[PDB]
Design an enzyme around this catalytic site. Structure first.
Site, PDB file in Angstrom:
ATOM      1  N   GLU A 240       0.794  -1.252   0.000  1.00  0.00           N
ATOM      2  CA  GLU A 240       0.000   0.000   0.000  1.00  0.00           C
ATOM      3  C   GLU A 240       0.836   1.317   0.000  1.00  0.00           C
ATOM      4  OE1 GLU A 240      -2.998   0.153  -0.730  1.00  0.00           O
ATOM      5  OE2 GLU A 240      -3.936  -1.752  -0.205  1.00  0.00           O
TER       6      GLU A 240
ATOM      7  N   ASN B 159      -7.912   8.306  -5.937  1.00  0.00           N
ATOM      8  CA  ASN B 159      -8.600   7.224  -6.672  1.00  0.00           C
ATOM      9  C   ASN B 159      -9.362   7.809  -7.870  1.00  0.00           C
ATOM     10  OD1 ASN B 159      -7.859   5.223  -4.658  1.00  0.00           O
ATOM     11  ND2 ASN B 159      -9.393   6.165  -3.293  1.00  0.00           N
TER      12      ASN B 159
ATOM     13  N   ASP C 293     -12.457   7.639  -8.550  1.00  0.00           N
ATOM     14  CA  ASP C 293     -13.713   8.235  -8.107  1.00  0.00           C
ATOM     15  C   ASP C 293     -13.616   9.603  -7.427  1.00  0.00           C
ATOM     16  OD1 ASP C 293     -12.825   7.481  -5.474  1.00  0.00           O
ATOM     17  OD2 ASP C 293     -14.639   6.464  -5.026  1.00  0.00           O
TER      18      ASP C 293
ATOM     19  N   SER D 205     -12.116  10.096  -4.461  1.00  0.00           N
ATOM     20  CA  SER D 205     -11.723   9.798  -3.138  1.00  0.00           C
ATOM     21  C   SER D 205     -10.146   9.701  -3.106  1.00  0.00           C
ATOM     22  CB  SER D 205     -12.389   8.517  -2.666  1.00  0.00           C
ATOM     23  OG  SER D 205     -11.904   7.391  -3.360  1.00  0.00           O
TER      24      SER D 205
ATOM     25  N   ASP E 153      -6.756   7.843  -0.825  1.00  0.00           N
ATOM     26  CA  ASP E 153      -6.208   6.891   0.167  1.00  0.00           C
ATOM     27  C   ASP E 153      -5.064   7.488   0.994  1.00  0.00           C
ATOM     28  OD1 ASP E 153      -7.970   4.990  -1.175  1.00  0.00           O
ATOM     29  OD2 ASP E 153      -6.251   4.375  -2.394  1.00  0.00           O
TER      30      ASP E 153
ATOM     31  N   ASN F 138      -9.266   4.885   2.745  1.00  0.00           N
ATOM     32  CA  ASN F 138      -9.909   5.598   1.663  1.00  0.00           C
ATOM     33  C   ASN F 138     -10.967   6.567   2.256  1.00  0.00           C
ATOM     34  OD1 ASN F 138     -10.990   6.387  -0.772  1.00  0.00           O
ATOM     35  ND2 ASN F 138     -11.968   4.431  -1.206  1.00  0.00           N
TER      36      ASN F 138
ATOM     37  N   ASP G 119     -15.663  -5.494   9.005  1.00  0.00           N
ATOM     38  CA  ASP G 119     -16.948  -5.107   8.365  1.00  0.00           C
ATOM     39  C   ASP G 119     -17.644  -6.162   7.468  1.00  0.00           C
ATOM     40  OD1 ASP G 119     -15.732  -5.154   5.774  1.00  0.00           O
ATOM     41  OD2 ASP G 119     -16.235  -3.005   5.428  1.00  0.00           O
TER      42      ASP G 119
END
Ligand SMILES: [Cl-]
Ligand SMILES: [Cl-]
Ligand SMILES: [Pd+2]
Ligand SMILES: [Pd+2]
Length: 129
Positions: free
Chosen positions: A35, A46, A48, A50, A52, A59, A101
């Site tokens: 990462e 990203n 979209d 967003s 990280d 994110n 989650d």
């Protein structure tokens, strides 16, 4: 801060990640490597819109507030900037909520593609934990 491999392992273990939800420490260290290259200040945008953040590239679409990700959630209740500290507390705390989650470590694409099903134990080989 750019951690050393064993340095990060030891920090992750102190914060309770070793076998957290059945993921051995080596999983976490491997995920961090791929990462962020162990760099607490890593940021990447990203497709979209967003972003990280940090050692585990958490994110802004779901987990933190960066002030510029419209229609996103802040499920860790933190500013994304907290994820960039040399202290990994916020990153580890939030990672525990992400991985609990339902999807586990599959939420980290680099873990799925680079670490999952590999000999992750190699990432903690030689370390004093
Ligand atoms: Cl923690
Ligand atoms: Cl803690
Ligand atoms: Pd902790
Ligand atoms: Pd710490």
């Amino acid at each position: 801060k750019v951690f050393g491999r064993c340095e990060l392992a030891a920090a992750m273990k102190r914060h309770g990640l070793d076998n957290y939800r059945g993921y051995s420490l080596g999983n976490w260290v491997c995920a961090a490597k791929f990462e962020s290259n162990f760099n607490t200040q890593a940021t990447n945008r990203n497709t979209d819109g967003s972003t990280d953040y940090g050692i585990l590239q958490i994110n802004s679409r779901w987990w933190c507030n960066d002030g510029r990700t419209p229609g996103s959630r802040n499920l860790c209740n933190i500013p994304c900037s907290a994820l960039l500290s040399s202290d990994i507390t916020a990153s580890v705390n939030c990672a525990k909520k992400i991985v609990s989650d339902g999807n586990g470590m599959n939420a980290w694409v680099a873990w799925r593609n680079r670490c999952k099903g590999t000999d992750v134990q190699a990432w903690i080989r030689g370390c004093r934990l």
